[PDB]
Design a binder for this molecule. Structure first.
Ligand SMILES: [Zn+2]
Lengths: 109, 212
């Protein structure tokens, strides 16, 4: 779709102020790792620039340890280029060996 | 049965492990029970190989998920090697059991606890550590730092851990997320709520190795 996935890591998306941007990333939160902004939160680092809602979708599977998908539904609040910088990590630990990074830039005119 | 049980106090529980980002909780959960029952029967506490279960259980999917009962079934059928013999790599590789000489231990079978029954689970924990499942994806479970946990969390289980004890109002659970999580790696989940699923679905599906 216009869903942003791992394949778009590092990409710049041109967006309208007020447009919901759909980000979907593989996530396995029962490993204790999930996707966070710096500091270990799901919340926008600057609510003035963009707003973020987050939802985790488990696989419809009974396998213990089967990963699902985290959605971040991101709304741009202001004109500018805004970096959405996520890290896959244990939020009580911060970055570790297995951590990964995902960035998208949202350019709003 | 006792008012309190804590297998760590009997030397039957090895240190807390870290599964990494691999979806291997099913294998970690199983191994806690095996380590526990071997101490109970033999008097020795050894570490056994999560990696072997990851690589060798053809019914499970490596870091893509699995079943603690399936790992126990494998150990009953074929046995398991020591951790130092077959160390954790946190990614699935080829099954290397045959290159590792004879298995270190083998169990005699796998048994399920009567499900959705708190008393049945406590009786089993009083005998030995038990593999249990719960709903652990929630933020509050992720951010758990200690105390008796009553939620919030759902009832659709997604994580396998091991119950290694209990008290009047909790069941003591060894997690596989390192010692920086919860109570040095442990969580006490509230019991006695009257909810048959248990808190976070804790009574959904519980298994233990049979070993004479
Ligand atoms: Zn979505």
């Amino acid at each position: 779709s216009h869903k942003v996935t791992k394949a778009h890591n590092g990409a710049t998306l041109t967006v309208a102020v007020g447009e919901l941007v759909e980000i979907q990333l593989p996530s396995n939160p029962t490993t204790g790792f999930a996707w966070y902004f710096e500091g270990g939160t799901k919340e926008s680092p600057n609510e003035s620039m963009f707003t973020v809602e987050n939802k985790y979708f488990p696989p419809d599977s009974k396998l213990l340890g089967a990963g699902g998908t985290e959605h971040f539904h991101v709304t741009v609040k202001a004109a500018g280029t805004h970096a959405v910088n996520l890290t896959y990590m244990r939020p009580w630990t911060g970055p570790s060996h297995d951590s990964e990074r995902f960035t998208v830039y949202l350019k709003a005119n | 049965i006792p008012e309190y049980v804590d297998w760590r106090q009997k030397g039957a529980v090895t240190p807390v492990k870290n599964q990494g980002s691999c979806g291997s909780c099913w294998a970690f959960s199983a191994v806690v029970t095996i380590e526990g029952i071997i101490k109970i029967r033999t008097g020795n506490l050894n570490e056994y190989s999560e990696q072997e279960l990851l690589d060798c259980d053809r019914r499970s999917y490596g870091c893509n998920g699995g079943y603690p009962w399936s790992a126990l079934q494998l150990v009953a059928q074929y046995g398991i090697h020591y951790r130092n013999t077959y160390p954790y790599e946190g990614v699935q590789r080829y099954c290397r059991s045959r290159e590792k000489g004879p298995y270190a231990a083998k169990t005699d079978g796998v048994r399920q606890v009567q499900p959705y029954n708190e008393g049945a689970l406590l009786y089993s924990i009083a005998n030995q550590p038990v593999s249990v499942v719960l709903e652990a994806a929630g933020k509050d479970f992720q951010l758990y730092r200690g105390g008796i946990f009553v939620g919030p969390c759902g009832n659709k289980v997604d994580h396998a851990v091991a119950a290694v004890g209990y008290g009047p109002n909790y069941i003591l659970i060894k997690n596989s997320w390192g010692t920086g999580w919860g109570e040095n790696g442990y969580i006490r989940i509230k019991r006695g709520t009257g909810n048959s699923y248990g808190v976070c679905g804790l009574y959904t599906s519980s298994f233990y190795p049979v070993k004479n």
